[PDB]
Write a protein that binds this DNA or RNA. Structure first.
Ligand SMILES: Nc1ccn([C@H]2C[C@H](O)[C@@H](COP(=O)(O)NP(=O)(O)OP(=O)(O)O)O2)c(=O)n1
Ligand SMILES: [Mn+2]
Ligand SMILES: [Mn+2]
Ligand code: NA
Ligand code: NA
Length: 325
DNA sequence: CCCACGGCCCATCACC
DNA sequence: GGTGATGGGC
DNA sequence: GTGGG
């Protein structure tokens, strides 16, 4: 909340570049600037002060100057008033509609929730589910409900096979009081980086959760990755909101790089890979690998904790609750 | 000045 | 029909 | 939009 007025401006500018301009690198630029400003311990009094930070350059500093002088930014006013940009920005709030589809709809004169209902025939399955649960999907999930969800997922997973390990990651694991969705990491001793020892590994768990009517809809489903919709049961009382759930099956011998990754935050992961590279390592969601002189990655290093990955790249260990960058 | 900007799974659509 | 191309998501 | 090169 120290520099919240600035980070809101930068976030809104970022979304505009992603959704409307389709400039993904500008989007990331703004997001980067917002994050670096966000973990800055003094409250910014001028743009030149902010320009000291990496990620904040000339253009953003100007915008910070204009904002601190007037409490708003003209560029954002023009954007909000512009009706095509407005329409396109809104449609992307529907799951399954990205910058491309949103722009295509608006060009056809389709630019509201009602217009989407009226033209439902033009939506794919994903976009239809997103439209259906539009309100629910923009609701935060209180941590109290996450724990109820966690209990159910962990248990039904046990009911299929007790050797399964299901770990809730994401913002939940970072100890957030509310989450946008539920992220589940799944492993089994059969599945390592050396085979396909079980087929239907992810299917069994998905199917079991559908059977107890916890999972209600499927957005996508393959052999290692499920993207879908879930809902808590009601005791008798108003229904719980339908929630987004992601399930990711990962080789058991790569569990810790997996849980590090799926815990996030997404920007923290960009920071960690960025530092890891300066220290002669390449990290992804699966492994950490050393680099030779030529910039050629060796074979995966041994990992048996999250702290192990931190030690290689010589970072002091940070609790998941301190990765919300 | 100029360019690189963590990446891969899954669904669908254009094209043959 | 099978594909390669692309979008959307994490 | 930014910073390293
Ligand atoms: N581009 C991306 C997208 C996601 N991720 C990782 C880090 C995230 O913590 C994890 C899950 O993403 P997520 O569910 O969209 N957001 P996250 O759980 O961190 O916070 P919420 O908005 O869900 O409450 O995937 C990433 O590293 N790079
Ligand atoms: Mn999440
Ligand atoms: Mn998620
Ligand atoms: Na700077
Ligand atoms: Na969307």
């Amino acid at each position: 909340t120290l520099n919240g007025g600035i980070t809101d401006m930068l976030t809104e500018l970022a979304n505009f570049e992603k959704n409307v301009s389709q400039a993904i690198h500008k989007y990331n630029a703004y997001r980067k600037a917002a994050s670096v400003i966000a973990k800055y311990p003094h409250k910014i009094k001028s743009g030149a002060e902010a320009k000291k930070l990496p990620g904040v350059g000339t253009k953003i500093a100007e915008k910070i100057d204009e904002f601190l002088a007037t409490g708003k930014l003209r560029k954002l006013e023009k954007i909000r008033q512009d009706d095509t940009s407005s329409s396109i920005n809104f449609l992307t709030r529907v799951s399954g509609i990205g910058p491309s589809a949103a722009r295509k709809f608006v060009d056809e004169g389709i630019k509201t929730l009602e217009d989407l209902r009226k033209n439902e025939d033009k939506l794919n399955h994903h976009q239809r589910i997103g439209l259906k649960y539009f309100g629910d999907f923009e609701k935060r999930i209180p941590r109290e409900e996450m724990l109820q969800m966690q209990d159910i997922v962990l248990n039904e997973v046990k009911k299929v096979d007790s050797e399964y390990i299901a770990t809730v990651c994401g913002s939940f694991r970072r100890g957030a009081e509310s989450s946008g969705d539920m992220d589940v990491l799944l492993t089994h001793p059969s599945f390592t980086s050396e085979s396909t020892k079980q087929p239907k590994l992810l299917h069994q768990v998905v199917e079991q959760l559908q059977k107890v009517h916890f999972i209600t809809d499927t957005l996508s489903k393959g052999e290692t990755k499920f993207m879908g919709v879930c809902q808590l049961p009601s005791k008798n009382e108003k229904e719980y909101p339908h929630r987004r759930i992601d399930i990711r099956l990962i080789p058991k011998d790569q569990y810790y790089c997996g849980v590090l990754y799926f815990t996030g935050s997404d920007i923290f992961n960009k920071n960690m890979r960025a530092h890891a590279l300066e220290k002669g390592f390449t990290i992804n969601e699966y492994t950490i690998r050393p680099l030779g002189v030529t910039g050629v990655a060796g074979e995966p290093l041994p990992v048996d904790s999250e702290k192990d990955i931190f030690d290689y790249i010589q970072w002091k260990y940070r609790e998941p609750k301190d990765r919300s960058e």
